Design a protein around this ligand. Structure first.
Ligand SMILES: Nc1ncnc2c1ncn2[C@@H]1O[C@H](COP(=O)(O)OP(=O)(O)NP(=O)(O)O)[C@@H](O)[C@H]1O
Ligand SMILES: *[C@@H]1[C@@H](C(=O)OC(C)(C)C)C(=O)CC[C@]1(C)C(=O)OC
Length: 336
């Protein structure tokens, strides 16, 4: 019958065999496998989203975007397996290139040198430059979706929340303050904040803004950035959120070099421009790439961009979204 892993059906044979559990997100279970047709190792993510409108959104968005992106620092989709009829389709298997680990797992075991922080940071921004050039926001960057192979190549993954320029997630320590405040008008700078948070974690092997909920999270951010300036306050669109922040006790800014006393000063300069409360003043991806911290790797001629930008699913019921997912995956079926 179907192949099985940890008591879960992984029906991807006969082409894909030798499944080995890797890990699990909040939505997908991921295995390595062997592709007997191309004679290569792959990863396969199983998702079962059709009972939940929000899971269907995640699935459709990830498939749609990843199939149009092609970049060394972004995971590609090789193949997609699902049932030959929509009525039988309950699971979707997304076949991707196999990576060895992710930044979350690496940081649990290793303290990175500065040269490795620069390289990983550069690869993040190089992928993000292409993403943002397509007018796409990733919106959920975090260490666990920064995949790594043995050659230390880095590929961004997990585009279920991506959108052209929310919902429950397993972590929001990497979310920009405006996400927790304004609740609308999200820009490319929200990704830059997330990258700033990842840079900080690579510098200390600890998350910079942990917190049990949004309120606690904002207190962590404010406890380091200090109370928002007048100009900062004006860039908050929702007046009730602005009044909330006005209600909090005053907080002084903690100098970055007190938090990271041994870090390279160039790294902290870039971190400061990334973890800027005001999204309009936050450094942009191409400016970050050209920052002196990254001069060993910066090479605009080898930092490609998308040919052209992309240019809604919240209203669609889950039955409509399942039709759309069936349609989007037909190109991997025989007889399309
Ligand atoms: N192509 C891949 N190669 C190797 N490991 C992978 C690959 N894709 C995912 N993983 C691992 O599997 C984990 C879960 O993948 P992910 O795509 O984030 O699942 P998700 O449930 O859909 N979203 P999330 O809950 O945010 O993690 C990742 O954090 C990696 O550890
Ligand atoms: C990284 C070093 C390494 O072992 O990578 C990790 C797995 C620890 C991240 C190494 O062996 C020499 C230098 C590299 C390859 C590197 O990327 O330097 C820029």
């Amino acid at each position: 019958g179907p192949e099985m892993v940890r008591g879960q059906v992984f029906d991807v044979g006969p082409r894909y065999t030798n499944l080995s559990y890797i890990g699990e997100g909040a939505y997908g279970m991921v295995c390595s496998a062997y592709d007997n047709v191309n004679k290569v190792r792959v990863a396969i993510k199983k998702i079962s989203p059709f009972e939940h409108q929000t899971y269907c959104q995640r699935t459709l968005r990830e498939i749609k975007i990843l199939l149009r992106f092609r970049h060394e620092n972004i995971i590609g989709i090789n193949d997609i397996i699902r049932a030959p009829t929509i009525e039988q389709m309950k699971d979707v298997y997304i076949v991707q290139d196999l990576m060895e680990t992710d930044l979350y797992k690496l940081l649990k075991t290793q303290h990175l040198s500065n040269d490795h922080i620069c390289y990983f940071l550069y690869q993040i921004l190089r992928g993000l430059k292409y993403i943002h050039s397509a007018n796409v926001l990733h919106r959920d960057l975090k260490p666990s979706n920064l995949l790594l192979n043995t050659t230390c190549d880095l590929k961004i993954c997990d585009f279920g929340l991506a959108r052209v320029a929310t919902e429950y997630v397993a972590t929001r320590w990497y979310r920009a303050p405006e996400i927790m405040l304004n609740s609308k008008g999200y820009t490319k700078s929200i990704d830059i904040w997330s990258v700033g948070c990842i840079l900080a974690e690579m510098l200390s092997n600890r998350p910079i803004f942990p917190g049990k909920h949004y309120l606690d999270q904002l207190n962590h951010i404010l406890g380091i950035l200090g109370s928002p300036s007048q100009e900062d306050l004006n860039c908050i669109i929702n007046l009730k959120a602005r009044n909330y922040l006005l209600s909090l006790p005053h907080k002084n800014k903690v100098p970055w070099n007190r938090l990271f006393p041994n870090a390279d000063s160039k790294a902290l300069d870039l971190l400061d421009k990334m973890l800027t409360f005001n999204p309009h003043k936050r450094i942009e991806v191409e400016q970050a790439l050209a920052h002196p911290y990254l001069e060993q790797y910066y090479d605009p001629s080898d930092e490609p961009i998308a040919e052209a930008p992309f240019k809604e699913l919240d209203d669609l019921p889950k039955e409509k979204l399942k039709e759309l997912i069936f349609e989007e995956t037909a190109r991997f079926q025989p007889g399309y």
